[PDB]
Design a protein around this nucleic acid. Structure first.
Ligand SMILES: [Mg+2]
Ligand SMILES: [Mg+2]
Ligand SMILES: [Mg+2]
Ligand SMILES: [Mg+2]
Ligand SMILES: [Mg+2]
Ligand SMILES: [Mg+2]
Ligand SMILES: [Mg+2]
Ligand SMILES: [Mg+2]
Ligand SMILES: [Mg+2]
Ligand SMILES: [Mg+2]
Ligand SMILES: [Mg+2]
Lengths: 75, 211, 191, 52
RNA sequence: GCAGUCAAGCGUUCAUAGCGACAUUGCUUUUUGAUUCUUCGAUGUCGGCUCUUCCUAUCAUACCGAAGCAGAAUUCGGUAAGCGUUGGAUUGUUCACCCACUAAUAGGGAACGUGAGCUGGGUUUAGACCGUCGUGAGACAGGUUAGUUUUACCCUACUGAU
């Protein structure tokens, strides 16, 4: 997903270890006759993802099926 | 999941404990309440220090959890992990509700959210018993437990002996004679009333007048 | 708490003669004369017997007292200045480019002219104050000497030169190039 | 030419200092408080970083 | 959304240069909810074009302080809103996403600025087609095509003029 949004073809793609809560990722990219390995950093940014926000606004489910039957003993 | 602690701060609603009507409630964040050297005799740890609340408030179950770790973590590293006995007096029983959801208020009663305490002015939250020399570590240990709570609380040096209901000299008056004996964690005292047959079985040092 | 009265003692030597009306402190001595307005401070000077003067504060707070001890020192330093005089020595520091300093005239004002500080084309002028006397020290390399009656003038005239030579957009921990005040002293020896 | 005396001469002014953690201000070496009133005269100071 | 406080883990040694989890204390009304006080003898209901002004929570531009600042190239913080912040491909779009120039392509407000200032692509009358639904009349906030934008000469304000 990150390599796809980089903005030559490429030989390989692997990534280094940045730290669990340190909002950053770093990744390395190897790319007719010249081979070149260079490294890139990605700032991670936090926000909301609509469905979750929708959970706090009461009307979460957004379609209901109310099945029913008038009998005391339902077979 | 968690709302801010400013919302469920003050004692508004009635006591709403777990029972056959509420039934479903989440597990408490705090689990073990006694820490340090909790298989220790009464003569070992005389000097007692409290952490006293100065506000009628609710302390949530995760406010005590973060407070209990930081007080223990400082006291374990500095003075050693068997130089004290920390006791968290406060148990969280009160269940908080949240209205997590045809219309808005057209049918509105909330689900259970979490457990919290109900603390009162002058109530003891943390109680620590220690040696005479190891005071300053206990005072500075409870200082960092204070930042994790809301409101106002204060530290007090107790005049009593350990966890006993007795003063410094009054315990020493009765312990010299055969009037006190060890229970296990706490302690047992002699009684003038009761059967005289089993007042002689236990307390063998009393009834002698010699040594 | 308000102190009922506090006082200090300005100890005058044999040579000088200190005059005071309102709070204008004249001090005539061997090197020259010095004057100072103290009308901002609120204290009472009181003579006792020529070679001793008392400064006083009555019903003074904490901060009011503090200043009373300052006024003693300023009046002490005029006395030491007009008798002994003040003398500050500064040194130049460099690695590659040597700093070229020279006194130059411009409408009869006299300026210290610092040239080639760290490879710069901008010429740096520092105007020489009234009373202070600058001289470049012989037989001590890259040294300069300022001297006169006032400390307030000499020290400021040195610090001006100190502050005209700053290094911008570099690591000053490394680029330690400048003109720095090495020794503060008096002109006369013995005392 | 660094020179042992002139290095210590210059380093007196530039390196031998301290710093307010809040306002980043450049203080004397044995200061308790910051002199700036924007950061409430804080006592949370540190020494200036040495070079190598 | 924005800000502290405490600081877990990181940052080869090293808590606090800098990244920064979780807790605990706040501010905002540029989000969305909750409510129904005002308006149903009607306050023109999206966006764009045009044009002024204000906020700073400052992207650039001036002067500074810190750095795990040799230099170059950066990162963090202070005063400061004085001065600037673009041309295009696709979409009715806000938003989004790309190409290009640049010193910089910062964020917001002013009846979610502005229809007797315009436009009318969008939504939201009547015509018409499809799909699913319904026995049927018909439903669809699903897709698609065509569809009237009225009045200043009054008082005030602003601009000029006796
Ligand atoms: Mg109403
Ligand atoms: Mg009307
Ligand atoms: Mg109108
Ligand atoms: Mg500002
Ligand atoms: Mg266009
Ligand atoms: Mg509008
Ligand atoms: Mg209008
Ligand atoms: Mg119109
Ligand atoms: Mg139609
Ligand atoms: Mg059909
Ligand atoms: Mg149309």
């Amino acid at each position: 997903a990150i390599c796809l949004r980089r903005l030559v073809r490429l030989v390989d793609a692997s990534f280094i270890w940045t730290e669990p809560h340190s909002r950053r990722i770093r990744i390395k990219l190897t790319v007719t006759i010249i081979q070149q390995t260079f490294e890139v950093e990605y700032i991670v940014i936090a926000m909301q993802c609509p469905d979750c926000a929708r959970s706090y606004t009461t009307n979460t489910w957004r379609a209901t099926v109310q099945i029913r039957q008038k009998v005391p003993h339902k077979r | 999941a968690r709302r801010p602690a400013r919302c469920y701060r003050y004692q508004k609603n009635k006591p709403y404990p777990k029972s056959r009507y509420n039934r479903a409630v989440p597990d408490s964040k705090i689990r073990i309440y006694d820490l340090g050297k909790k298989k220790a005799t009464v003569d070992e740890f005389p000097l007692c220090v409290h952490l006293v609340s100065n506000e009628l408030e609710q302390l949530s179950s995760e406010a005590l959890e973060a407070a209990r770790i930081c007080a223990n973590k400082y006291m374990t590293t500095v003075s050693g992990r068997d130089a004290f006995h920390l006791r968290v007096r406060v148990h969280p029983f009160h269940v908080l509700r949240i209205n997590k959801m045809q219309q808005g208020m057209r049918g509105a009663w909330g689900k259970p959210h979490g457990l919290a305490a109900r603390v009162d002015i002058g109530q003891i939250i943390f109680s620590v018993r220690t040696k005479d020399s190891n005071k300053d570590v206990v005072v500075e240990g409870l200082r960092r437990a204070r930042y994790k709570f809301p409101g106002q609380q204060k530290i007090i040096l107790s005049k009593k002996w350990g966890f006993t209901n007795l003063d410094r000299p009054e315990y020493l008056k009765k312990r010299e004679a055969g009037e006190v004996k060890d229970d296990g964690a706490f302690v047992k005292f002699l009684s003038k009333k009761g059967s005289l047959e089993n007042n002689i079985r236990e307390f063998p040092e009393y009834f002698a007048a010699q040594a | 708490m308000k102190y009922i009265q506090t006082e200090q003692q300005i100890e005058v030597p044999e040579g000088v003669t200190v005059s005071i009306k309102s709070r204008i402190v004249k001090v005539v001595g061997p090197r020259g004369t010095l004057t100072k307005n103290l009308k901002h401070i609120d204290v009472t000077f009181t003579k006792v017997n020529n070679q001793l003067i008392k400064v006083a504060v009555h019903n003074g707070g904490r901060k009011h007292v503090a200043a009373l001890r300052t006024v003693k020192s300023l009046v002490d330093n005029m006395i030491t200045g007009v008798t002994k005089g003040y003398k500050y020595k500064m040194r130049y520091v460099y690695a590659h480019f040597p700093i070229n300093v020279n006194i130059v005239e411009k409408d009869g004002a006299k300026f210290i002219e610092v040239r080639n500080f760290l490879g710069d084309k901008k010429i740096r002028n520092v105007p020489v104050r009234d009373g202070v006397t600058i001289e470049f020290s012989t037989n001590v390399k890259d040294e300069i000497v300022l001297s006169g009656n006032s400390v307030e003038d000499v020290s400021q005239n040195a610090a001006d030169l100190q502050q005209i030579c700053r290094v911008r957009n570099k690591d000053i921990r490394k680029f330690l190039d400048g003109i720095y005040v090495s020794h503060k002293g008096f002109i006369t020896e013995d005392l | 030419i660094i020179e042992p005396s002139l290095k210590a001469l210059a380093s007196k002014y530039n390196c031998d200092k301290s710093v307010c953690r809040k306002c980043y201000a450049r203080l004397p070496p044995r200061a308790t408080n910051c002199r700036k009133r924007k950061c409430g005269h804080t006592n949370q100071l540190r020494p200036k970083k040495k070079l190598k």
